Ligand binder design. Structure first.
Ligand SMILES: N[C@@H](Cc1cc(I)c(Oc2ccc(O)c(I)c2)c(I)c1)C(=O)O
Ligand SMILES: N[C@@H](Cc1cc(I)c(Oc2ccc(O)c(I)c2)c(I)c1)C(=O)O
Ligand SMILES: C[C@]12CCC(=O)C[C@@H]1CC[C@@H]1[C@@H]2CC[C@]2(C)[C@@H](O)CC[C@@H]12
Length: 248
C-alpha cells in the first residue's frame, strides 16, 4: 500500500556520532559524543518528519513543536531497533562508531537508564515486531506528546494522529487471520509505545541536569541541542507538555 511505501522510503539511513574510539572512555567524551549524535540525528528527524504524509499540513509552529517534544522518544525507539537488528540487543547500538557495552553504560553515569533502553530493545524480540510495525509505531511516536493546553490547531493534529493509528490497524490486520490475536496485537504494540514515554522522561531529566552542569563536567552541547533542552524539555519536566498514553 501507498502509506507503507512512503514510510519505508523516507526511513533515515545510518548516522555516525563522530566518536574518537581511540581515546579512553571518559564521561565527558562519551556524553559529548551522544549530544553530537543527537544533534546530527535531529537533522535527519526534521527531514524525515517533513517527508511524512500529512505532516506539512499542520501549523508551521506545531510542526516544530511536536518535533522538539518527541525527538527523544523517537531517537530512543529507533536506537532500540538498531540494537535489536544489529547486535541482538546485546548492547546499545547508538551509532556504528558509538556502541555501548556494560563498561560504557557505567562510564556514561546513566547505567539504569541504559538498562531500560536495552529492555526496550529486547522487547522488539519477544514481540516479534515486524519492520512494518516498527515504521508505523515510530511515526506514531511523533504525535505522542503535546502541550496540556493543546497545539495551535489541535483539530488537525487529532485527525492526523487518528489517521496514523488507523494505519497501524491496517498494518496489524494485513497478515492476521483471527479476531483474537489481531485485537491482542494492537494491545501489545500500544503498550510498547507507552513504555517509551517513561524512558524518554528519565533521559529528559538527565540531559536537563547535565546541561546545567555542562561547564562543571566538561560536557559540550551543540547549538540546537542546548536550545531545545533549555526551552522545550523544561516544559515537559514542569508538566506544561505531557505525553499521550493509550492506557492508564
Ligand atoms: N531544510 C530542511 C528542514 C529544516 C527546516 C528547519 I525550520 C530547520 O530549523 C531548525 C533548527 C533547530 C531545530 O531544533 C529544529 I526541529 C529546526 C532545520 I535544522 C532543517 C529540509 O528541507 O529538509
Ligand atoms: N491511506 C492512504 C494515505 C493517507 C494517509 C493519511 I496520514 C491521510 O491523512 C490526511 C488527512 C488530511 C490531510 O490534509 C492529509 I495531506 C493527510 C490520508 I486523507 C490518506 C493511502 O494508503 O494511500
Ligand atoms: C537521543 C540520544 C542520541 C540518538 C540516539 O541514538 C539515542 C540517544 C539516547 C540518549 C541521549 C542521546 C542524545 C544526548 C543525550 C540527551 C544526553 O544529554 C543524555 C541522554 C542522551
Amino acid at each position: 500500500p501507498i502509506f507503507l511505501n512512503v514510510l519505508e522510503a523516507i526511513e533515515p539511513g545510518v548516522v555516525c556520532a563522530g566518536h574518537d574510539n581511540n581515546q579512553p572512555d571518559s564521561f565527558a567524551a562519551l556524553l559529548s559524543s551522544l549530544n553530537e549524535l543527537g544533534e546530527r540525528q535531529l537533522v535527519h528527524v526534521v527531514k524525515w518528519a517533513k517527508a511524512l504524509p500529512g505532516f506539512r499540513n499542520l501549523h508551521v509552529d506545531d510542526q516544530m513543536a511536536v518535533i522538539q517534544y518527541s525527538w527523544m522518544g523517537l531517537m530512543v525507539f529507533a536506537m532500540g531497533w538498531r540494537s535489536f537488528t544489529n547486535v541482538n540487543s546485546r548492547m546499545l547500538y547508538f551509532a556504528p562508531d558509538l556502541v555501548f557495552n556494560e563498561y560504557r553504560m557505567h562510564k556514561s553515569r546513566m547505567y539504569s537508564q541504559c538498562v531500560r533502553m536495552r529492555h526496550l530493545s529486547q522487547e522488539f524480540g519477544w514481540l516479534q515486531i515486524t519492520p512494518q510495525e516498527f515504521l508505523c509505531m515510530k511515526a506514531l511516536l511523533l504525535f505522542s506528546i503535546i502541550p496540556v493546553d493543546g497545539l495551535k490547531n489541535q483539530k488537525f493534529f487529532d485527525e492526523l494522529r487518528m489517521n496514523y493509528i488507523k494505519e497501524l490497524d491496517r498494518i496489524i490486520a494485513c497478515k492476521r487471520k483471527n479476531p483474537t490475536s489481531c485485537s491482542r496485537r494492537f494491545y501489545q504494540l500500544t503498550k510498547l509505545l507507552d513504555s517509551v514515554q517513561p524512558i524518554a522522561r528519565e533521559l529528559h531529566q538527565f540531559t536537563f541536569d547535565l546541561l546545567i552542569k555542562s561547564h562543571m563536567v566538561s560536557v559540550d552541547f551543540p547549538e540546537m541541542m542546548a536550545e531545545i533542552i533549555s526551552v522545550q524539555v523544561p516544559k515537559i519536566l514542569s508538566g506544561k507538555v505531557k505525553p499521550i498514553y493509550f492506557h492508564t
